Amino acid sequence: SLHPHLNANLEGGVLTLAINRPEAKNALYGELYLWIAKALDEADQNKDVRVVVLRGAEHDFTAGNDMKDFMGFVQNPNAGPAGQVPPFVLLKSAARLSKPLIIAVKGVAIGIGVTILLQADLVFADNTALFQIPFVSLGLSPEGGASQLLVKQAGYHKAAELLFTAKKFNAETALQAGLVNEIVEDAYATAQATAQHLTALPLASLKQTKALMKHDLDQIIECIDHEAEIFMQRVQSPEMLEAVQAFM
Amino acid sequence: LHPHLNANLEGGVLTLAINRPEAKNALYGELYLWIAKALDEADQNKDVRVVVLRGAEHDFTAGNDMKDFMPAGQVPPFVLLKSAARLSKPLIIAVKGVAIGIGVTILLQADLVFADNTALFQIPFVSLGLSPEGGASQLLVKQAGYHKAAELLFTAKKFNAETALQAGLVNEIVEDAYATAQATAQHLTALPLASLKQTKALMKHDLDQIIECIDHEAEIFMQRVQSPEMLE
């Protein structure tokens, strides 16, 4: 389906999904998380798509959860299963994509801008990238399976430093922690050349290799869901509501 | 009290400083047990938000007192390791000078570790005719990767702060280890308590299995303790 703030282009088996909400530096709201999730789900069924590239359209990847949206949410929270709240739907859609998923990062990549990297196979950034996992300082808790995936990808000590302190960090830190594969001059051209190289390789080899690497997908999904339950406890906490009420 | 352990609580930060400079903070039975009890009670004390563990002066710990040296899960060093692993609040370690044996394996229970360029690390267990402690045979493989963990465990070599940093034992090498630790501790005491507690509990979802690895290692260790290798 066509929707604002998300451009899709398919050429030579490469599907490029580009977040395009510059007025807000690509902050994500409820329905945009779902539109991105649906596009991933449809790409995986589309026989003309072999590789997906997800990035921003321009100078930023994502400023994270839209704060205006978030404050309306805290005052009227989704009462359904925590795992069906929009950001967890996107993160699971990404985790389950059977085809290679490449992400290219410029500028801000905050919250979900970091945890979605843990669902991608390859990540390229340039030196303008500025990352943060702000969940602790917002009064929230991990999402995207990061309590387990970031410990595995970065090592326990580094994962605890980025999660506990909630600090901003640069591309060299993200590269040392294994969140980014390489820092390059043109993140978007590199992501596109890599995607073209992958479409020239056998689809079945790629699909099977990825399926073996992700043999524990069911447990990853379980981790995302159980995190989501704890995350909603924090979203619904009395202290969160008072703080939003004041702010508003 | 016990003059070998300075404890101090300020602004939510409890600072535990091993103070036995005559023996380079080498540790002996009852002292393992007091540090363990202090960590246990820290977790129960609502005025305590973050613990920092370090040496008082130029050294972290020379490891087990060879004099002191001379149910396996209840032998003192293992008691301290489990109390560290169980602490539900953030635990920061700051390393200067020697950090030997349990001086390294205790770092695998800490959430954040800071060191300066004087730090000198070693896991001598293999060369003492012994075996791993502190869950190192799983925790160090996970933290450093298998190849590097094998290098540190098998060879029993001393290594410096840059090697520890690359293996993920140390978060950052800084000019003033104790000041950096205190500043991080104060930053963490200013953040929401339930957010830090639930984040740590998720990260340590496999705590039961860490305790079982520490206890399994303990049984093996205590057997090696009564072996000709050890004597030689």
Added chain:
Amino acid sequence: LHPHLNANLEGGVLTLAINRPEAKNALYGELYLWIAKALDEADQNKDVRVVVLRGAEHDFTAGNDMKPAGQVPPFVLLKSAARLSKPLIIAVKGVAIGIGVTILLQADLVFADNTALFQIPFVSLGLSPEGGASQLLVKQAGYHKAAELLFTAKKFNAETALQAGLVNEIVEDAYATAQATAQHLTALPLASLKQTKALMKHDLDQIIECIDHEAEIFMQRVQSPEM
């Protein structure tokens, strides 16, 4: 004893050296089986305390010679290396292709020089992982780097291997470093090394199961149109 494989024991160090330089140490069926058997015997050999495995003067192995899945020879070698109860050290120079990389994941220590040229080419042949790589490389290098090396089938150098944890140290003389390290380890208590390694590889049966699972998939692909 067997064509293209040298073996030397001294001071408790067994050095096995692949010796087929005219072919850049490309491996064929029988040769896989001889290396694997030598590892099986070294483990039963009371006078062996540490094993070094290496290639020829300039190269480790160009990989599988172009010219029950669990019993196909490269998988037998991969499992023999994984089961070896004593320390295994590999020293890498020049080419290290396919098996040349996946065997590093079964060694305890790996030393290379800057001539090393690594590749995992299976995807570009329409095949699939081997060596238990789909799990062991993810654990050793992290998921992103393992994906990069496995999906793209790119050739890569010693610095990239060091960053991926595949290599412990890049050194000037990989054979001398491997020998000095092995001599240090033979001087230490075999009982301590044995028991430390067995704890580190507590999940050995899971490792072997992954190797065999990959093997069955691999052998299907071998009959694919892509291949």
